[PDB]
Amino acid sequence: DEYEFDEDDEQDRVPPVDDKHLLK
Amino acid sequence: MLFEVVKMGKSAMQSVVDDWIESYKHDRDIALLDLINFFIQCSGCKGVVTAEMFRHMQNSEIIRKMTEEFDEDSGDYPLTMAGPQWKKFKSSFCEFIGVLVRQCQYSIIYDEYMMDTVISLLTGLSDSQVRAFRHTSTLAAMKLMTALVNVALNLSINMDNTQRQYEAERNKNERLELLLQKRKELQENQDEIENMMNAIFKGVFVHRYRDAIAEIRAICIEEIGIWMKMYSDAFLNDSYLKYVGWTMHDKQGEVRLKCLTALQGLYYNKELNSKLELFTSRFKDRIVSMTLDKEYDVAVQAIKLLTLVLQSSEEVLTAEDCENVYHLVYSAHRPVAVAAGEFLYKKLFSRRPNANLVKTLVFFFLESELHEHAAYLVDSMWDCATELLKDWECMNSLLLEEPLSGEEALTDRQESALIEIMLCTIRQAAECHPPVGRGTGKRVLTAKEKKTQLDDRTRITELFAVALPQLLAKYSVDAEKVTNLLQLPQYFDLEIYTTGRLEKHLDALLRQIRNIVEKHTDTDVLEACSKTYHALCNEEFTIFNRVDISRSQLIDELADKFNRLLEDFLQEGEEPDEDDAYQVLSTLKRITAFHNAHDLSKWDLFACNYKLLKTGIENGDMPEQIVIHALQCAHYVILWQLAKITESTSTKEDLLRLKKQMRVFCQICQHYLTNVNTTVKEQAFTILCDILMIFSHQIMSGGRDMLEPLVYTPDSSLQSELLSFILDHVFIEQDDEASKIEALHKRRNLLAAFCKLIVYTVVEMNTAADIFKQYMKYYNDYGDIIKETMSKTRQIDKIQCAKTLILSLQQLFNEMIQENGYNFDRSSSTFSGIKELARRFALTDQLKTREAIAMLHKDGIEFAFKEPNPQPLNLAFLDILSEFSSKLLRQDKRTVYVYLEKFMTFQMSLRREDVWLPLMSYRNSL
Amino acid sequence: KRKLIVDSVKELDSKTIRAQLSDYSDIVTTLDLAPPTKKLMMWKETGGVEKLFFLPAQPLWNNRLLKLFTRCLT
Known about the structure:
Chain A: It comes from Mus musculus. Chain A: It is found in: Nucleus. Chain A has no helices and no strands. By secondary structure, chain A is low in regular secondary structure. Among the domains of chain B are: about 1-210, no CATH class; about 795-925, no CATH class. In chain B, helix 33 packs parallel to helix 35 (about 735-760). Chain C is mainly α. Chain C has a domain at about 35-75. Chain C contains 4 helices and no strands. The radius of gyration of chain C is 27 Å and the shape is elongated. Chain C starts with 13 loop residues before the first helix and ends with a helix. Chains in contact: A-B, A-C, B-C. Chains B and C meet through helix 8, helix 14, helix 27, helix 31 and helix 33 of B and helix 1, helix 2 and helix 4 of C.
């Protein structure tokens, strides 16, 4: 199941503050 | 400044990192800005990030400003830039990242300012469309995460240690409470490092492992393999392995090899259960298929990975996949073949005295219909199964002794396979060089290798000096067996026969060889026998005399028989029966085989061969095989006599006798050249080319002026017949497959004989014209030979070579007008191909080449105007000549243009609106 | 314009990754067999201009006979 490919990109939501990515 | 220091500053990265840490202590923002600009400069960007940018401007905006502030002069960036300074820079960059993490790993890493800033900047740069930013940032992020994985692993170890200490204290109050609190803070540190690692993985890896650029993908794949090896309990999971498994299918081979190496680490570690069971079941077929990857290095790595998987569980690979790997031991690529042979040795030959392993090797070799000999199999497994392959004692015991209780006697086919394998191992041990297509064979042996080879050779000699007579006697009737067994003595140290007082075994071997020459009529058996006798007849070895004596006896008997046979065969009234012809043919075959490798001039056998040949010319019922072997034997007689007549002390009248013999035999070969049986013509042509070369002018070139009478200049009829043989036989209609390959090799050798005559000026250069006209037509079949001939003829005489090339093109032109009317279009594939061949010739220019090409153009225009209009017919040929116009220089172009203008006067230069366009095109090219 | 390398598509789309996983025929090949017969192996060595132009058309099994052909060469 884990090896079944389901990834997709170029539709990702942009981060709010790029300056602080470690916020949480 | 930091970028310059890392680039070539020749300063330890530890010192650089420590200075940056001091700067961070003084002002954190200033050091962070310097680090940001460090990463920017490492990408090649010449701009600088402002403190206001770092304070307010978003990373995306900063990246855009840096793209517009790049001041790039090219597309090169430091990571792609080649050169030792830049390789050192790459290494120092990665080391800087690692050391920066290491030096901050107990405090500054948990400050949650510099680490968060660095990961944010690196993620932003990993998203950039600019390849420099993306590439550099991705490499930096992977190195950073490797360092963070090491930090987290150390944290886990220290946590386990504190828990063990608390456990000991609990077994036995303030100390154990200290220990609990220490574990708590260690867990908080591990969660912080986990946030950082998760950020890098989910924000960079999952996007860059599928990057458009293959380099970036390879970086990410390699580093995830490193993480899995480093921290197996936390990173050897399906959640991480899936990326390697998916990217195993990447079209680029670099990425595929990266995946394979990453997997090899884990499979070497023998964890097995560590999610590797699921990964094996999921991607086993992919690995097995990668054994036949488009990239050979990838394929070798896949085979090695399969061997590792076999070491893990063995039965997991199943028998079908193992058989797929087995086939690869017969591959042309020696790395793939030896990896597969290692796999095969570990699969069945490893578990095992060697007799059952020898039988299993014979059965495997027979089961694989791929190869008819064991040379490449033995080569594949020579480094792994050397003890088994060198157990010659057990093998010859299997072939000799058979009754071993319950053991089933080997089938005759298995016995042949066994003698084949034994011979191959003996050959590879005697000469420490691989079979052709696997190793060069011309490599200086190591001292260790020379000592091993000497030991193997002594063992082979002493074992088979006794084994070989027995083996030959047991298998005397079988021809393949006796040929293979007869090849053994050539790998012996004949001094061992004398030193080890084994002369009786040598006598038995000699008698067995003579017996099989008497019994056998197969050419290969007789050849192997003469070869073995030649190897044994070494004047420098003491056994020589003995062998020589036996050799003489054999010849004597044969000769006598032959003579008697011939006396009855060449009789005025003696209709030959098929048995009579078979008798004379068999004895002639034996005598020819031995005369090729031995000086039989004492027996004076030229008379018999010549009488047979002239009787075949007259009567015309002579068997074709008799004619072939008689031609060969007379050829060898002449050759041996030439070798003898090299000193005035030897003889003077025998020189004249030899000259007469050679000329007569050449006439006989010319007669047999015009024969109905193609094989007879082939034998005559082959021997005739070799004779002409051996007896060319060069026969006196090197201090052999006494051989000056012994020259044969090919008469024009002879040259014509040889060229006609080439045209009829070598060049044929272009259309099982292995038989076609064999026929092509025979035709190539024939063509090479006549081409040797051409390149060594034995025949006229002009003949080569026809050969040259087939250069494109038979590029695959004979193009190498035609190319070499053409280059050699250029070196001989460039002007005459240009003339012969223009003759070939003219021949193609008038052949075109003969096949198709003068209405042939320029676009017609025939004329276009003639122009293409002319371009090829043109490529073949100040080194007298200008003079030769002037002559070529002269001949071209003369041919064009040789046929005038009935009411110029070869005007089209000017286009052909236009292919060479470029190589002509303007200064020489003026003279050839004078000749051309004299050909068309002036009205023709004006008249060019229709079919006179080739003339105008050539005129422009000038 | 500028020579800076700007990749408009930074990523392999999910469809191309699925295609890589589904079909890997373009990245496999057949077996390049080493010479299967002794004659083909002998032709691998003896054949070829390097040896053809330096070896006789009729094989001479004694180096003394071969030496005549070779000394006449070049």
